[PDB]
Amino acid sequence: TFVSSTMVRAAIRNQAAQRYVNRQESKLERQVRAQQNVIPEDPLDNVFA
Amino acid sequence: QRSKPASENVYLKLLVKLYRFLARRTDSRFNKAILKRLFQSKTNRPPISISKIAALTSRKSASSQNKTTVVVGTVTDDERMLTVPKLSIAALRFTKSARARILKAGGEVLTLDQLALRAPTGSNTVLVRGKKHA
Amino acid sequence: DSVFGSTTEVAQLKKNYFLPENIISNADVTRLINSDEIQSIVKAAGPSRVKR
Amino acid sequence: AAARPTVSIYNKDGSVSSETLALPFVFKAPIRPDLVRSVHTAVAKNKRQPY
Amino acid sequence: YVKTWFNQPGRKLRRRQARQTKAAKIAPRPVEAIRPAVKPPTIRYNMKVRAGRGFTLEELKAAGVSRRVASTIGIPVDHRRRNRSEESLQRNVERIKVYLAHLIVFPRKAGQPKKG
RNA sequence: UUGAGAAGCUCAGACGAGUAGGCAGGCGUGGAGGUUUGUGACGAAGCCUUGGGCGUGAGCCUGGGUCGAACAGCCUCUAGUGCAGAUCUUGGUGGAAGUAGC
RNA sequence: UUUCAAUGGCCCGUCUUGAAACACGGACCAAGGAGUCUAGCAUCUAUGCGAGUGUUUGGGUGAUGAAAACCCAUCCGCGAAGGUGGGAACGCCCUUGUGGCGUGCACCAUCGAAGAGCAUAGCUGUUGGGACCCGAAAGAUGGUGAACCAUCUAGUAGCUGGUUCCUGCCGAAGUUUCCGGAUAGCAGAAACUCAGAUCAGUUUUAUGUGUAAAAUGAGAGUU
């Protein structure tokens, strides 16, 4: 008949532990796409610069 | 009822000024519809994702040809899909992630002013909307 | 060119900052309306003031 | 957005110089009197003292 | 009972001014002492790395610094922390060794009695 | 034909009670950043006046008399911001009354 | 402007009462004088960004107030975890118009089983906080010579009296129904779909007073 009330206390801990690692991964995955999804140089904009 | 936007984006009061003339001086319903939606609140203009646009043009029989999708509102991307198709899109706003993704692989992005000078009557344009429920 | 950036590149000094992208490109409306590509397709013109 | 590629640098004596600078990309950004007002409106309450 | 944060720009400048007098008193040495690298003691952050309090006695002896002098060249000591994993001993010994690479030590004059 | 403050100009028709209540546009006060390259000892602010005007109105502009050192229009910011009452607070002042009376 | 002539007009506010009657409050003038400040929640709108979002705990910095501005490290919070028809918009036409052929958004029917937030500002609403303003014997602690003083105290209210500039538009209900309430209804405010569609404190026709199907009008119905 299920675990313990304080053993469901850890059920948040096995829910919250993978928060920080997920968030850090989301930070680098967003940055990785940022390098990928960038506009090219537009070689015509160095005529005056 | 609604005949003046609640906005104060000065450039949206110039976009409306262009489509108030077009709506009343052409017989197309695309312009009368576009003008109405330039009056709608931010809540009533949902974001329309790139993938949702990509599905609509390439829907059922596909045959996208070179139709231009038009939406009043932002066009946020969808990183959950890798290969974006060629698209010509007109919208009030894009997201820098989305606009790069359209530009990098395929066609071009447009603002509502560049669509008007190309298809003032709504010539061969798909007018879409995002999911309102939210 | 480095403190603000560009609408494509990013300011070297302000991290991840791109200049805003506008609702329209050509902000001059009277050119948008009074252009050929629109004035060639509008229907006829009524009087500016209609006589009583 | 097409406008005025180059600007001219003036020396101390007031005479123009042959060198020039491309007009920065910032100088084409949107001009928003409402957005500047509602930001200056706020940012100007930040050096206030309490009474 | 209500607190206001009007002295928030006052307190920050007081802290900066408090750092500058410390730098004035102790010129060559850094305003901050070195701290080790440790891992937070929880399943949520255990894969992270942050700073500790000081270097344990196995971290000092392995790196090659006695525990008594370590307090004097700015290396702080934590008698409570211990090394259970060698990767924790390794990340902090090399942290000491890189510090002693950049550490200039000023000689001190020493009493030299005529006899012995 | 000049009538693009497109937030403009123009045309047509019907309509108009109002409590509770809902919506909208404005007038006014103190101070705040911008502005009028603003006003002021050749007279600011204020005050009175059966002077002249403006606005449906809140209100405003001006003439005269006093007056003597400051003040305002415009765009925004802001709040200890609008009075006929509360046996309202404070000060002043009448009738009662030259009365009760001493 | 004062005055006269002719016509007129029961004292104002509150409360009461259908209404008054009332009972109140008002000797006069000036000044003071009452939805405010804040935390929480939800809504609408505006703005920035958008599968993201939020610099201001703090650090960096700021020579011309340096309590401003400007910049970002490590966290963290809140998010993120298929066919059928009707359909907006468009194209092709083609007896054109009429319509058809299509492509079919939002969404709704049907059969079924391609994220939209976050943050700031405003508005209105609500809950607390002294809580629109004024007013009920207090009580308690501690003092002074049953009495008196000082504070806690912004103690307590369904109640009483008051709550301040103008114009414009819309404008009820005044009560069913269950049951102090949840409904409803009236009024709005938004979003929708249609005038080739439905309606009506309507009237006829006729079938058996009800019901069903012609005129007279109005666009009507939803969430």
Curated annotation (Swiss-Prot), chain A:
Localization: Nucleus, Nucleolus; Cytoplasm
Superkingdom classification of source? Eukaryota
The entry assigns this protein to a family as follows:
Belongs to the BRX1 family.
State its role. Answer: Required for biogenesis of the 60S ribosomal subunit.
Write down what this protein is called.
Ribosome biogenesis protein brx1
Which gene underlies this protein?
brx1
UniProtKB/Swiss-Prot annotation, chain B:
GO biological process, any:
cytoplasmic translation
S-adenosyl-L-methionine listed as a keyword: no
A GO cellular component annotated for this chain's UniProt record is: cytosol
Which keywords annotate this record?
Cytoplasm, Phosphoprotein, Ribonucleoprotein, Ribosomal protein
Which cellular compartments is it found in? Cytoplasm
Modified positions (Phosphothreonine) are 74, 76, 121, 125
- Domain of life, per lineage: Eukaryota
Phosphoserine: modified positions? 3, 51, 123
Q: Which GO terms describe its molecular function?
A: RNA binding; structural constituent of ribosome
Q: What is its main location?
A: cytoplasm
How is this protein organized at the quaternary level? Component of the large ribosomal subunit (LSU). Mature yeast ribosomes consist of a small (40S) and a large (60S) subunit. The 40S small subunit contains 1 molecule of ribosomal RNA (18S rRNA) and at least 33 different proteins. The large 60S subunit contains 3 rRNA molecules (25S, 5.8S and 5S rRNA) and at least 46 different proteins. eL18 interacts with NAP1.
The family classification in the record reads: Belongs to the eukaryotic ribosomal protein eL18 family.
The protein's role, per its UniProt record: Component of the ribosome, a large ribonucleoprotein complex responsible for the synthesis of proteins in the cell. The small ribosomal subunit (SSU) binds messenger RNAs (mRNAs) and translates the encoded message by selecting cognate aminoacyl-transfer RNA (tRNA) molecules. The large subunit (LSU) contains the ribosomal catalytic site termed the peptidyl transferase center (PTC), which catalyzes the formation of peptide bonds, thereby polymerizing the amino acids delivered by tRNAs into a polypeptide chain.
Note, other: There are 2 genes for eL18 in S.pombe.
Protein name, UniProt field: Large ribosomal subunit protein eL18A
Tell me the gene name: rpl1801
UniProtKB/Swiss-Prot annotation, chain C:
Its annotated compartments are: Cytoplasm
Task: Look up the domain of life of the source.
Answer: Eukaryota
What quaternary arrangement does the UniProt entry report?
Answer: Component of the large ribosomal subunit (LSU). Mature yeast ribosomes consist of a small (40S) and a large (60S) subunit. The 40S small subunit contains 1 molecule of ribosomal RNA (18S rRNA) and at least 33 different proteins. The large 60S subunit contains 3 rRNA molecules (25S, 5.8S and 5S rRNA) and at least 46 different proteins. uL4 is associated with the polypeptide exit tunnel. uL4 interacts with its chaperone ACL4 and the nuclear import receptor KAP104.
> Any idea what job this protein has?
Component of the ribosome, a large ribonucleoprotein complex responsible for the synthesis of proteins in the cell. The small ribosomal subunit (SSU) binds messenger RNAs (mRNAs) and translates the encoded message by selecting cognate aminoacyl-transfer RNA (tRNA) molecules. The large subunit (LSU) contains the ribosomal catalytic site termed the peptidyl transferase center (PTC), which catalyzes the formation of peptide bonds, thereby polymerizing the amino acids delivered by tRNAs into a polypeptide chain.
Tell me the protein family, please.
Belongs to the universal ribosomal protein uL4 family.
Further remark: There are 2 genes for uL4 in S.pombe.
State the protein's name. Answer: Large ribosomal subunit protein uL4B
Provide the species name.
Answer: Schizosaccharomyces pombe (strain 972 / ATCC 24843)
Designated gene of the protein? rpl401
Swiss-Prot record, chain E:
Q: Which GO terms describe its cellular component?
A: cytosol; cytosolic large ribosomal subunit; preribosome
One GO MF term attached to the UniProt entry = structural constituent of ribosome
Its GO biological process annotations read:
cytoplasmic translation
**Broad class of where this protein is predominantly found:** cytoplasm
Q: Which domain of life is it from?
A: Eukaryota
Q: Where in the cell is it found?
A: Cytoplasm
Q: Could you list this entry's UniProt keywords, alphabetically sorted.
A: Cytoplasm, Phosphoprotein, Ribonucleoprotein, Ribosomal protein
Kindly list any coiled-coil regions of this protein.
none
Q: Which family does it belong to?
A: Belongs to the eukaryotic ribosomal protein eL13 family.
Q: How does it assemble?
A: Component of the large ribosomal subunit (LSU). Mature yeast ribosomes consist of a small (40S) and a large (60S) subunit. The 40S small subunit contains 1 molecule of ribosomal RNA (18S rRNA) and at least 33 different proteins. The large 60S subunit contains 3 rRNA molecules (25S, 5.8S and 5S rRNA) and at least 46 different proteins.
* Chain's role: Component of the ribosome, a large ribonucleoprotein complex responsible for the synthesis of proteins in the cell. The small ribosomal subunit (SSU) binds messenger RNAs (mRNAs) and translates the encoded message by selecting cognate aminoacyl-transfer RNA (tRNA) molecules. The large subunit (LSU) contains the ribosomal catalytic site termed the peptidyl transferase center (PTC), which catalyzes the formation of peptide bonds, thereby polymerizing the amino acids delivered by tRNAs into a polypeptide chain.
List the protein's name: Large ribosomal subunit protein eL13
Q: What is the lineage of its organism?
A: Eukaryota, Fungi, Dikarya, Ascomycota, Taphrinomycotina
Fragment boundaries within the full protein?
Answer: 21 to 136 of 208
